[PDB]
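Example complex used in Figure S2.
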Amino acid sequence: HPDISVDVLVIGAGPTGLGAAKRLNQIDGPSWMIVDSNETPGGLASTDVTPEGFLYDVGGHVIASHYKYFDDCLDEALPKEDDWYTHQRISYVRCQGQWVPYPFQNNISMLPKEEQVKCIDGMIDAALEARVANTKPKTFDEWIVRMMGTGIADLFMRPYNFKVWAVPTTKMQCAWLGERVAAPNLKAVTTNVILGKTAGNWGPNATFRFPARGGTGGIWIAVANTLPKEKTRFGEKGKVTKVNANNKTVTLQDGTTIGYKKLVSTMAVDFLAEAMNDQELVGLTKQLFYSSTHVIGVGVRGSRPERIGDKCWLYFPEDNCPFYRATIFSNYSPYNQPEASAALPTMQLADGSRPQSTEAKEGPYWSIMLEVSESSMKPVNQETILADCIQGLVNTEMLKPTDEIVSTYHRRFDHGYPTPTLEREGTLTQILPKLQDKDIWSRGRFGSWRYEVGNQDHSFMLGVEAVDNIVNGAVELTLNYPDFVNGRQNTERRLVDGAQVFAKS
Amino acid sequence: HPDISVDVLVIGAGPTGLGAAKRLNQIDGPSWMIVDSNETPGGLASTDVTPEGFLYDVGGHVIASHYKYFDDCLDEALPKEDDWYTHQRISYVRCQGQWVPYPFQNNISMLPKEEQVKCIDGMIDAALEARVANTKPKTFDEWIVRMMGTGIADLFMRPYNFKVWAVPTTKMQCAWLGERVAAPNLKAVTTNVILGKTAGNWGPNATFRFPARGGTGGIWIAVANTLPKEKTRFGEKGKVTKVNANNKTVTLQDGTTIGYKKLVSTMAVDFLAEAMNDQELVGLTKQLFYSSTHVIGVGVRGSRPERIGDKCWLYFPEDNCPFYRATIFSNYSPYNQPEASAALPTMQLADGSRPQSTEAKEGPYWSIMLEVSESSMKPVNQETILADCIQGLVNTEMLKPTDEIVSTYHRRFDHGYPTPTLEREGTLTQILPKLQDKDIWSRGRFGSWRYEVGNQDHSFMLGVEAVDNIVNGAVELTLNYPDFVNGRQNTERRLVDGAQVFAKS
Amino acid sequence: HPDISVDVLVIGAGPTGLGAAKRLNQIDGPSWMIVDSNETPGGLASTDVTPEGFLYDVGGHVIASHYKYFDDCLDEALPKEDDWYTHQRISYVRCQGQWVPYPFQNNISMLPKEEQVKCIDGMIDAALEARVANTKPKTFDEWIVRMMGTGIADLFMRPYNFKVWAVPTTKMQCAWLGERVAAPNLKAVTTNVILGKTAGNWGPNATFRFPARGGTGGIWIAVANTLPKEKTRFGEKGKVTKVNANNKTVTLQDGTTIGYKKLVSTMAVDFLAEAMNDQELVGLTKQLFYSSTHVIGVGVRGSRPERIGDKCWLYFPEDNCPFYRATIFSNYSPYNQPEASAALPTMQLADGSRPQSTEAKEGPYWSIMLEVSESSMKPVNQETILADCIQGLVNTEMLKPTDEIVSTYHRRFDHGYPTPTLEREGTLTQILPKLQDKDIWSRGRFGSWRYEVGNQDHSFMLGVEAVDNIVNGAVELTLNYPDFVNGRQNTERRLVDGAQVFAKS
Amino acid sequence: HPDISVDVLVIGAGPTGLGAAKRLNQIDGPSWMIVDSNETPGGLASTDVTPEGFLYDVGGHVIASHYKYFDDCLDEALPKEDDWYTHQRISYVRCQGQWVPYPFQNNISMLPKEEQVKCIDGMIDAALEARVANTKPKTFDEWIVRMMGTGIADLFMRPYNFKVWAVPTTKMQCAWLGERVAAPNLKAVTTNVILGKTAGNWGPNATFRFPARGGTGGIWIAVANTLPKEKTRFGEKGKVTKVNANNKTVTLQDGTTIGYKKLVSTMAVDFLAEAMNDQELVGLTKQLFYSSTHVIGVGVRGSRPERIGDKCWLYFPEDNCPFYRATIFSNYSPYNQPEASAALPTMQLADGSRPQSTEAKEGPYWSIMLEVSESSMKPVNQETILADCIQGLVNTEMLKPTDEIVSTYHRRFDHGYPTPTLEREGTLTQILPKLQDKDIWSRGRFGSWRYEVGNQDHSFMLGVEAVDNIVNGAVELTLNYPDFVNGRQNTERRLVDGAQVFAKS
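Predicted assembly (2020 residues):
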């Protein structure tokens, strides 16, 4: 007989696990507990801080919620207006010395006329081909070229997406992009070119909110704080080392055994297969592909440069920098970096030189957060990637040679992106139903490995819907139908449902 | 204060209302009750019997279930193998003296060669147009011609659907038919013509089960008998006469008032509007279109004629009979008509003659169930429709002039089919939200008025999902996404869910 | 017995008849004779001169030769290099205050940006339609809109062609335009728009030669002068008044009778039918459509204005002027107008004002030749057309209000354009075979009524080929296959053929 | 000074050279002379006779005249009604044990139904592709598949054409087939399949005439007889051995020298290059490709078998016979083989065995003429080809094993077909203009090497038009525009033109 017995055991307290726990808590029927090897919940949605007081998320995290249930829980966790800042969704592509507003194709009037000609000719071919197309594209690369044409594809989406996925676009599927037919809006693109118009896809109605304090990790700390503590086990004490699916027993690092009826596992499924000592599954999970993420943080002395302005995140297709995305993290909250009166010495100049003077000088400060991908098809030299990133900031005119860097951050995350390879779905249909047949709900960014439902809200709801399926027989829509959940406002499920209203009365 | 108060009130005990009742009874959380103006539950899924012992459903009723939950409840209601009979889904189209197997286009080798040429040429045109189509059809008629071509459309789907819907195909939408592209399978059609092949879309895998006793109506009597009797109020004592949405009170025939927190209403929504005394809603619901259904039943003396054989239902595009559909109801269960040793006099011969003898003679017996539509665009003479129907049986060679009729049946159902007109959605998206804002879930074949989810299983699940939405925040998938639920096996929701399992432990 | 008898009689000494005569004279086999009612040969390719010394062709006459035989005869007639001037084929379209280089669609970068967007959107639509087109256009109007799209059609070719043909584009065929697929060159058009580029279809190799003296008329006088005079009868003494097809006799004005074996008639075929007193033929030729041509000439004091420059001819789609085409005739030869030292009084200013002085003043001078079309569907007030033309010159900014007019010219030509109506070929294929059966070769711009082979070189060659058919059994290629002769340089037939070479030896 | 000087010298007295001769003779202007190495005119349009009295043309020769001039000369040469037999153009394809009427695709209803399905499926694919096709086919093979689809292509046009051209279809151009769009008539093919219908492309209006006596060669002997004998030089005395293009002198085998001004050469252009000792031309003409033709004749004892009947020529795509075409040559004229009273011994039975009796026996007799192609890509065993052909006749059921063969014939013609390879035009546009500049008109089946104008009428007219271009400056239409002459009735040029009429008077 195990040390602990619950109806539903949740493994992992990132957004997916916390989601399962929140729904389990709301329903308040079956017994449950949640474990995590980390003392701080949040997983890849956590936040680090440098010794100099600069916060960094695990790369650019911007919330775009598809669900009221997610909203309810974030509101409960951080109920004050002062707990959040709101920003418009401002992003640009760096291309040929210019900041081109996203979406790229609507803004190519910024490029030289000769480049515009190439882009439009390319898009005209794609329009004419789309007119007689009667097959769906089979790879990411095909989808891109059918949408954009060759010229526009080559300038942005093709090289950018290799830099992101660390695999060629020709090796990825394209179903994860949704149901929209791959064809250009030639009229829109030519119209902006003719008018000499630029326009970004943001405005007063395209916004996101970011926690005032603690970065994205502040959300999951606060969400986890609403749970009954005695149903949690976070830290070394909650590290899972063995899963015996046949016995329905989990063994923790310290020897504790937990017997479960149903298991919601949100750890990476390849980790799960190993903990299961299941050779068949280890074999299958090894067929999945993923990239690692290097997060580089740079803290900079000065008031925010005009050339930076209200930019939020930024895309880099070109090979004059190693990162694919930059985030002006200091724009997200004034509390992501020290107050202006905090005194810090200059660590280095952006040109790589180190000043002799160790004088601590005041701010204000701003902060850049960068991401570099790694895979078996794209190695990263860990010893030089910080300096290479900083030179990249100089090349892209984000930093002047003389800008004073007062803090640096670098951390490599092993499981960063689950890759939508051509083989992904075939491998998953062998893995997830096998786990299902053992009453294991493997869910989450790497729990179920689908990037198209791999954001914070998706992950949260993968956990919530897994519990809802377990308890109430609900359809796991986010898991099986990403296009369905992503194409609608999901408003039906709420932190207070009729069940709780009727019960209280 | 009202005579009775419940959390959830369900009006109507046809399949939709019984679905709501079943799910409420399973959840066993919020209080509830169900009412009906009829002492016998079933609604349009009920069964009548003639004084001579011939059963008739409300027209051809064949179960094609898309949900496990539905199956669960039917298995619970009628658990014995002896409670059901299984049959292949056998149907034909009556065309030019021939019984053409369904689907019609795959079987036109039974037509004159010169006619096959016109059909194939028509479909060739449709195939060539479909290759370069860049728009969806906007009407049912356009959908039909794009799928079949002019020649085949004119033989079956165009005149048949006018006879069913009592409105022209050009006046109806086609979104209700689902997301499949409107285009011909030219090779399938030419292949069967070249091979001289006939092929029906049935066999060992394509079957349905039909209740052994009491007709389709026996299902719903049995399902209702699983409910706690005291939460039911069926008969004149259960007839709703007034709905006060602002006070959340319902008034019954006998003066009884019921207070509710949430209302699931499964009566026709135009009747609901009347019972609410809501002028705006009455205005809107009057803009909805529907057809009435005449059901004609004919009991015939004799063993099953060879020409009839194992036929189940039959379509009639042509103008030599008033019915659009016939069902060989005696093929569905040997208990839909009297036993062979039951003695009955011949009422008339099929050509209308008097019988040579008026004394009771034994069987065996077989039985035909016919349907005739009526609308403001297609009147039906009630005084002569029985006689016209019987003449139709002769014209279509279903009866010989000498066949002996031993029982007749005629009944008119006012609300028969909810019509997918071009205007339907424009109207419903004005009605259903207004009811929703008053905590009224109006659901069902005429509760929510959508034929594409208008079968028994759809209706049951509309009730089930409305409750699940009320109590558990579930998405009402059947109501809002017909294509979703009809395109998948809906297996997640069960009559015993996790909630009930964990509760008992 | 007639007064004169020849093997081949040619009626008319315009280009077509002179072609017949040149070939007859070269062959020197059958006896022959050519007549004309005008003392001066040249027909519609003749030239008038005002009392003040300004020459005017019959509207813009620019030579574009498809035949070396035509070239040979022109070289023979006017052999000196001093006999000709060479110019680039410089043309513009007047649109919205701008001189837009031809071809119009390649130069819409000159238009307002909002208009460019509408133009490009229309041509995108045409490009996409053209990709799936499986039918030929059936009218001139369809041809135009399929080539240009709605926006560009509406700016130039649709209104301009009404002004030219004096019938709507919807009433004309399009076979006469050749074999080219009706489809846009979207890339060409978008590229110049993107580049902000203009480009006319002319250059050092896109030229024409014009006679130094006597206008276009000087060519045909010189060509006719190479013929044996005694075989020509030009003037009142050459006016044909009756053609007895049955007796192969022609009666002239003065009563001279001419017997022939074969007749080449180059007069208008409706006049020929009348001269034949052939009722059936009069009816048929009456079904042919044609427009009349008003030629207006304006002589202007001053050196060539900068705004005019090297412009040759000009197209006018808009309604602020009655003419469809303008020619800067002073640019074709310095001898089309008086020398600078010639003294002329100012007749009026361009705004209609009297001059300050009526004294004869010196030049230099320049000159504009205008064309206005007339038909039953487009009446022309002959009393006001000159004044309206001059106002149109001010409206289009060809003339300043202050420009001094020193000579005016106006002549109406009854048969100006033979119209490619939808009915043209139905009618011609009844007329030409009947004439042929009587050994009458009716040929020429109105002799056979086909505009697509209606220029000077076509006409000349129609005469030549008619003779070559009569004598040598040659195919009349220009007559029956416009696309054939227009799509090649016809090099085989020369003014000195093998026959004359072998004979001289 | 050469022995003989003429204005125009014609080398070769096949149809092309005779055409040149007839036109020169008609014009009666320049002096001329025609030479041939054979005593008998006709070339590949000649006829051999076996020692047993069986005539054979050089393979099946059936006249289909596009020209009135050709008709004129044939009528002059053979003026009597009994100089000719008229037959319908009856042809069949041998395929899977059956004679299928030509055109094959309209008659596939004769094939097994499953095979019809594959044929129609293939043609449906090709129709759908043709609906969106915007490129011309570039090879003969692409052309075939676009017209027929894969299934039908593989049954007839692909294997047959390899057997004809002795090169794969993928190695040939397709321009030579004309301007018709490469696309199936799906409706016509499926219609005959549906109706179970067969129809050949012949009847009372689809006929050919054949000379009563002497085979096809009788025509050209007769045409030659109309020429002034002293201007002909036929046999060893007329064999050209050397051409000196710079001196314009031809040397004959007997040493005779002929000076010319213009040369019409109708020998194979690769032979002409050799005779010119022009190494550049030798190299060029070696790039042309041709196949050799083996003609096999089989004379058979008996009245014409019913299984043969009225068949004229027959196509053989399959591998059970080496010949590609058979002609029932005894059907073309009763004088193509001996009268029934002629006594001949049986040489062998068709199964290869010796005859029972070696005695001369009476007829009647019938006769089969076969063609086998050979090239560097398709070698032929010349030692066994007669036996292989005879066995081929047994395999195809044209002959019974017991049929008595009384005569056999085999002759290999080295230049048989000029092959429309992909390279042909690139080579010919270097050859023919180079010869042209030297005043050499190289014309004819191998004179100018274009099979699409390679029949008797084409050839004849290539000669006629060469002369007409040399003397009258005519366009060489047949040479340069095959689609033009083939697509019309060429009626303008006659054996008596106006020139001869006007001169006689």
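The CA atoms of residues 136 and 181 of chain A lie 8 Å apart. Chain A touches chain D through one residue (CB under 8 Å).
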